[PDB]
């Protein structure tokens, strides 16, 4: 099934943050309305933040997260969680190798802000 | 019900990251084995990271997140979500006022690392 695609409320500010836990350099692309709005790149095996950004969901609200390592797309896992019917989380995990820990690039999207 | 308390695997490294979305300074306390392991403090209305760190779940694996503003404890919402039976997220939201957006301090715990 398709992973890493989330439908946010339109024209809403959201935060996106990426962590790295891999020997390979992780590249995270954040797509809004099917067009690249942010790109994070970095390497770390200690959960270092390779990028954090505030974006706008745009007119369609469609937000897609893509992860790649040296041009090869990573396998993604994703889910959305809503707490007390207000606080939203869009979580993405990714695997670039064989150990299947799916933390090589961890992307957290949270909204609302402010 | 009790919120902000998660049972992690024992002696396991985990990342903890806090965001701020409020006019008040957020004080986030991360407890391990009922003892304060880390304290984040900052103010932001644009989802700025007021703290990110790698900690150890300890001999019991008990991790508690506490949030307070000007000494007054905030109301917490929390849940844990596991993706592909391996990737773990512990999420915390907090409310310091009356608008009930529960993003004033957002804490995300993720494991495993590396
Ligand atoms: C090799 O590059 C694979 C890779 O890096 C390891 C340090 C570990 O994080 C593994 O999960 C990751 O896929
Ligand atoms: C005011 O101090 C309350 C406070 O700050 C606002 C800017 C908004 O973020 C609100 O949710 C927060 O509780
Ligand atoms: Ca991996
Ligand atoms: Ca890894
Ligand atoms: Ca609030
Ligand atoms: Ca707020």
Numbering used by the authors:
A (entry chain B), B (entry chain A): 1 to 114
Provide the authors' original text about this structure.
Herein we report the first X-ray crystal structures of mixed chirality α-helices in short peptides comprising only natural residues as the example of a stapled bicyclic and a linear membrane disruptive amphiphilic antimicrobial peptide (AMP) containing seven l- and four d-residues, as complexes of fucosylated analogs with the bacterial lectin LecB. The mixed chirality α-helices are superimposable onto the homochiral α-helices and form under similar conditions as shown by CD spectra and MD simulations but non-hemolytic and resistant to proteolysis. To get a direct insight into the structure of AMBP bp65/bp69 and their linear analogs ln65/ln69, we performed several crystallization studies using either the compounds themselves or their racemates to be crystallized as pure compounds, or their fucosylated derivatives of both mirror image peptides as complexes with the P. aeruginosa lectin LecB. While previous reports of similar mixed chirality AMPs concluded on either unordered conformations or helical conformations appearing in a membrane environment based on deconvolution of FTIR spectra, here we reported X-ray crystallographic evidence of short mixed chirality helices consisting of only natural residues existing as helix bundles within the protein environment of a lectin and almost perfectly superimposable with their parent homochiral α-helices. These direct observations unequivocally demonstrate that the α-helical fold with only natural residues can sometimes tolerate multiple stereochemical inversions without significant conformational changes.
The same was true across the ten different X-ray structures of linear α-helices observed in the X-ray structures of LecB complexes for the homochiral Fln65 and its mixed chirality analog Fdln69 (RMSD < 0.9 Å). This comparison showed that the helical geometries of the homochiral and heterochiral helices were not significantly different from each other. A similar α-helical fold was observed for the corresponding linear mixed chirality peptide ln69 and the homochiral sequence ln65. Surprisingly, the mixed chirality sequences bp69 and ln69 showed similar CD spectra and an even stronger α-helical signal as their homochiral parents in 5 mM DPC although they contained 7 l- and 4 d-residues (ESI†). To test whether the α-helix was stabilized by the bicyclic staple, we repeated the MD simulation with linear analogs ln65 and ln69, which again showed rapid unfolding in water but refolding to a stable α-helix at the DPC micelle surface for both the homochiral linear peptide ln65 and the mixed chirality linear peptide ln69. The mixed chirality linear AMP ln69 showed comparably strong antibacterial activities but reduced hemolysis and much stronger stability against serum proteolysis compared to its homochiral parent ln65, similar to previous reports with mixed chirality AMPs.
